[PDB]
Amino acid sequence: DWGEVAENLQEQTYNIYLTSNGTFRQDNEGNENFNYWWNAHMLDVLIDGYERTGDESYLPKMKSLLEGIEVRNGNKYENVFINNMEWLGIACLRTYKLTNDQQYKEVADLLWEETKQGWSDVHGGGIAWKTDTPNSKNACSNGPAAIFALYLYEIDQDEEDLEWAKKIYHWLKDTLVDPESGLVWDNIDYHDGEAIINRDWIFTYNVGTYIGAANLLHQATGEGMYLDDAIKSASSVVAPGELTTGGVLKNEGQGDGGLFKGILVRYFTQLALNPDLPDGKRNEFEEFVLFNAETLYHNGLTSAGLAGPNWNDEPSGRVDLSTQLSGVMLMEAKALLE
Numbered sequence: 001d002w003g004e005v006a007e008n009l010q011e012q013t014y015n016i017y018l019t020s021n022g023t024f025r026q027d028n029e030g031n032e033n034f035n036y037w038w039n040a041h042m043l044d045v046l047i048d049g050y051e052r053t054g055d056e057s058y059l060p061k062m063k064s065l066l067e068g069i070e071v072r073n074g075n076k077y078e079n080v081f082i083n084n085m086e087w088l089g090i091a092c093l094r095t096y097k098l099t100n101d102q103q104y105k106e107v108a109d110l111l112w113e114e115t116k117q118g119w120s121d122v123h124g125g126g127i128a129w130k131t132d133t134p135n136s137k138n139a140c141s142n143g144p145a146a147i148f149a150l151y152l153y154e155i156d157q158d159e160e161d162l163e164w165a166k167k168i169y170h171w172l173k174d175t176l177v178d179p180e181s182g183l184v185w186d187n188i189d190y191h192d193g194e195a196i197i198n199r200d201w202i203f204t205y206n207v208g209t210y211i212g213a214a215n216l217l218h219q220a221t222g223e224g225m226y227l228d229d230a231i232k233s234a235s236s237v238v239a240p241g242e243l244t245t246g247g248v249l250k251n252e253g254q255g256d257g258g259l260f261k262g263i264l265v266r267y268f269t270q271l272a273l274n275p276d277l278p279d280g281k282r283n284e285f286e287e288f289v290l291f292n293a294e295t296l297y298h299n300g301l302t303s304a305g306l307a308g309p310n311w312n313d314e315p316s317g318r319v320d321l322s323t324q325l326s327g328v329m330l331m332e333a334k335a336l337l338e
């Protein structure tokens with residue numbers, strides 16, 4: 001029972017990482033630092049549990065987390081990293097779609113206004129990484145911005161938001177997507193006076209949000225090109241290459257990188273749920289999530305239920321919250337697909 005596994009991990013995560021004010025600590029050792037974007041993804045994990053169970057017990061924990069983020073972020077929701085605001089805004093819109101709780105919509109509305117301010121024509125378009133890095137346009141600040149815009153379009157049907165989604169996605173595809181594989185390069189910035197793309201950094205979460213944005217744009221327009229884009233990127237995830245070792249999504253370390261795998265699995269799974277996906281691709285994608293979930297469960301989880309950065313080995317020491325969230329996201333995705 002994969003839902004039973006996910007619920008066990010939800011409980012272990014909440015029990016080990018909950019700190020004051022309804023937020024979640026950086027690790028299970030000596031660090032109580034508040035990580036804004038990690039806590040945003042804990043909200044996503046709590047939403048995963050709510051959708052699977054229908055258990056209203058998740059709702060007060062979600063609300064306490066939303067309000068605790070405001071306090072620990074300095075009595076505000078704005079953050080210097082634009083991608084951080086995008087992650088929280090996405091989770092807030094997800095919550096509003098399921099609960100109609102206007103408090104989440106108001107936060108999302110604020111964060112969308114800030115996200116749109118990061119856009120510029122530097123490097124041809126794209127949302128900046130930070131409010132003060134006008135020249136650094138990163139996949140992690142554009143993939144999520146498109147997803148953000150698409151959720152808002154589903155909710156408010158403002159034509160300007162669909163235009164934003166299309167413009168963000170098409171800049172991302174034209175700039176940071178490898179035309180041969182569909183995988184996503186990390187960023188473009190000025191180095192020694194000229195624009196350079198970091199092609200060495202190919203992370204699971206960047207192709208993850210590209211897949212997620214393409215899937216949502218296909219749903220919002222019906223244009224097959226978006227589905228073709230998503231299938232190509234997801235097929236490269238499955239086939240041997242940069243992001244897998246022995247068919248398992250690879251170790252990307254702890255800290256921020258601990259969260260990368262879970263984000264890819266979330267949006268990969270959403271593509272596997274698209275009704276227009278061909279049967280053979282759906283089977284291949286479902287089998288890939290199962291293989292990863294089985295690997296983590298049997299090889300990578302501690303007996304208490306903590307996941308490490310390598311899904312194929314148990315962590316012997318500190319477990320960052322980000323790393324743990326990727327494990328819970330994997331199990332929730334597996335339970336969703338059964």
Ligand SMILES: OC[C@H]1O[C@H](OC[C@H]2O[C@H](OC[C@H]3O[C@H](O)[C@@H](O)[C@@H](O)[C@@H]3O)[C@@H](O)[C@@H](O)[C@@H]2O)[C@@H](O)[C@@H](O)[C@@H]1O
Pocket residue numbers: 037081083084138139140186187203252253254255256257258
């Ligand atoms: O070794 C450096 C980092 O490499 C890997 O992270 C890749 C990303 O690094 C940057 O983003 C990191 C964090 O920056 C802010 O705090 C905020 O935006 C956070 O949300 C963000 O995660 C940036 O260059 C991104 O474009 C890269 O993709 C991981 O291994 C990290 O853990 C590691 O510290």
Ligand SMILES: [Ca+2]
Pocket residue numbers: 007011
């Ligand atoms: Ca429970």
Ligand SMILES: [Ca+2]
Pocket residue numbers: 054055056
């Ligand atoms: Ca209920």
Ligand SMILES: [Ca+2]
Pocket residue numbers: 075076077
């Ligand atoms: Ca305030």
